[PDB]
Design a protein around this ligand. Structure first.
Ligand SMILES: OC[C@H]1O[C@@H](n2cnc3c(NCCCCCc4ccccc4)ncnc32)[C@H](O)[C@@H]1O
Ligand SMILES: [K+]
Ligand SMILES: [K+]
Length: 546
DNA sequence: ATGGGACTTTTTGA
DNA sequence: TTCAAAAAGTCCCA
């Protein structure tokens, strides 16, 4: 588990923290990487430091011990007092020690401050002027349970529930950064918007000044790695303004090596720059330009309801082993299953704007199987094919579920009604009215309108505005950006969407019903639908005053 | 190939 | 008892 940061980003991160260091005022800077690995960052730090000392060698010689400050002594001084590294992989440390040693190319026993340890457990004996690197990322599924108990116990300020391991590295880096120190790291971007990152965001904002955020959105920074990156630079300097530079990429299809340096890319048309006042950050960090902020605030102020106010949200079925319970609707095995047990089953791709595709799969709602003797053929010939994997689910091992039951079968009556469904990850808003009692896994979310809000909001009106170009832009302002052309559509944000009622209600709803009626007929022509959508977008923009 | 596009399971803490 | 979040996604092709 060793990952390579592209050289252009490494140089930017090191230059960011060291470009303005006053080596004459302080010729003993402590630069640390608690993830150093083989030394992607530290070896570049050595090069930057060596030039810095060499360019001012006579000034140091005059101001300080003139026998100590010579070009010949620069190498030894850097390793003794300046470069610090830590990594849990001793093979990586051994390689980095050879690399630092070979920078000069025994005389006398030069010591190198490299620690092979868990950086989250090391008793750090002092703080550091500059901290750079790329921490490990490990989510809640892939982190060992025994280790996770330690993080919950000792890193509770930033790590709880579905948090990530790199949250704790942010915590450690901030804690061991000197007063006036500067830190710069590349991490996943998700903590900027994710629900899990709320505590971490609060910790950063209240303990450091965030100088700069480079947000690569869905661009693929790490080749053959499914992750989305950002670069954060922060300091512990006494400043009275604390404004953040935000560099947000404009096109995710860029290759990172367009120029020789990352600065050229950031100042180019390929990025956009804007400023955010750190003191105006709430638990949410809404990092958008002034046009988007004006747009976002207009909608928030005009809308007196949220979806959570008026609707009941729920996540789909989690069977725990889909292959055991999900069959093609033309599978011959379904003749063994009484149709009282069978439900229509759709995937996220079956959701379009305003309507759902006809289902091609069936779910065996195995909870309603009374016992193991009356429906033996279903258990023996269909579900029992995966009995080993089924028995390994957590609730089966604890005895809460029978081996053939659905892990989280939810409540049938929630799905067997008129409701709205949307995919959990999509490039655009796709909210559909479900007329067919469709069930689904957790890749599709559903909601239905509360009974007391039915005389104010109809399903037809909701899919109308929710699928509009206005609401697509509006939702993406604060949505969690996952990968290229993919946003999370999860209730923790979808239910915070705000909605309105005014004089345009009837016409918006009527346009929605025409769209639905066209989308459902046989000789379907989408052309008029696009025109109707353009007209509805005009009404909505009129309604919200944008 | 390795870079790009289509599509999305069930484990898990609370 | 039972909710919903979580991409160092996953997998395939050219
Ligand atoms: O990938 C990023 C780089 O960072 C290094 N690293 C990874 N984790 C730590 C680290 N503490 C966290 C350790 C988490 C281990 C989780 C685990 C526990 C038990 C069994 C199994 C697992 N402390 C220092 N360096 C680290 C990698 O080696 C790598 O070079
Ligand atoms: K001197
Ligand atoms: K990406």
């Amino acid at each position: 588990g060793i990952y390579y940061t592209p050289k252009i980003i490494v140089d930017y991160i090191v230059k960011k923290t060291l470009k303005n260091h006053d080596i004459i005022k302080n010729p003993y800077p402590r630069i640390l990487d608690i993830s150093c690995g083989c030394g992607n960052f530290l070896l570049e730090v050595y090069d930057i430091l060596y030039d810095l000392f060499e360019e001012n060698i006579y000034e140091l010689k005059k101001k300080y011990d003139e026998n100590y400050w010579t070009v010949d002594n620069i190498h030894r001084h850097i390793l003794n007092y300046c470069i610090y590294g830590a990594d849990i992989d001793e093979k990586a440390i051994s390689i980095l020690k050879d690399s630092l040693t070979n920078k000069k190319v025994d005389e006398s026993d030069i010591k190198i401050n490299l620690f092979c340890c868990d950086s989250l457990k090391k008793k750090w004996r002092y703080k550091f002027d500059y901290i750079v690197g790329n921490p490990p990322y490990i989510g809640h599924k892939k982190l060992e349970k025994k280790y996770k108990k330690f993080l919950l116990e000792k890193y509770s300020e930033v790590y709880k529930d579905k948090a990530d391991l790199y949250f704790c590295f942010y915590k450690k880096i901030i804690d061991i950064l000197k007063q006036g120190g500067i830190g710069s790291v590349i991490t996943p971007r998700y903590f900027l918007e994710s629900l899990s990152g709320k505590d971490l965001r609060e910790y950063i904002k209240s303990n450091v000044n965030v100088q700069e955020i480079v947000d690569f959105l869905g661009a693929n920074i790490f080749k053959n790695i499914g992750v989305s990156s950002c670069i954060l630079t922060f300091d512990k300097k006494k400043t009275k303004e604390t404004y953040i530079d935000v560099f947000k990429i404009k096109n995710e299809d860029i290759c990172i090596n367009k120029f020789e340096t990352l600065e050229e890319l950031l100042k180019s048309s390929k990025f956009e720059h804007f400023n955010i006042n750190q003191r105006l950050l709430s638990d949410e960090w809404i990092l958008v330009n002034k046009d988007d902020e004006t747009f976002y605030n207009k909608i928030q102020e005009k809308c007196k309801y949220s979806l959570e106010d008026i609707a009941i949200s729920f996540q789909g079925i989690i069977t725990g082993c889909d292959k055991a319970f999900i069959l093609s609707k033309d599978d011959v095995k379904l003749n063994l299953v009484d149709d009282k047990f069978l439900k229509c089953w759709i995937k996220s791709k079956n959701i379009n704007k305003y309507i759902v595709d006809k289902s091609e799969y069936r779910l065996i709602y195995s909870n309603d199987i009374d016992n193991e003797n009356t429906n033996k053929r279903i258990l023996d010939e269909i579900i029992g094919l995966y009995k080993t994997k089924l028995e390994n689910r957590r609730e089966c091992k604890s005895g809460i579920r029978k081996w053939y039951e659905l892990q989280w079968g939810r409540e049938k009556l929630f799905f067997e009604r008129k409701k709205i469904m949307y995919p959990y990850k999509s490039n655009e808003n796709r909210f559909a009215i479900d007329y067919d009692n469709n069930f689904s896994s957790a890749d599709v979310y559903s909601f239905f309108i509360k009974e007391e809000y039915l005389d104010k909001f109809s399903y037809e009106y909701l899919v109308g505005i929710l699928n509009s170009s206005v609401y697509d832009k509006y939702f993406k302002i604060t949505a969690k950006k996952m990968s290229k052309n993919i946003y999370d559509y999860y209730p923790n944000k979808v239910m915070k969407i705000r909605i309105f009622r005014d004089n345009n209600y009837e016409e918006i709803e009527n346009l929605s019903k025409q769209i639905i009626s066209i989308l459902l007929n046989k000789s379907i022509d989408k052309g008029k639908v696009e025109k109707l959508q353009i007209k509805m977008d005009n009404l909505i923009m009129d309604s919200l005053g944008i």
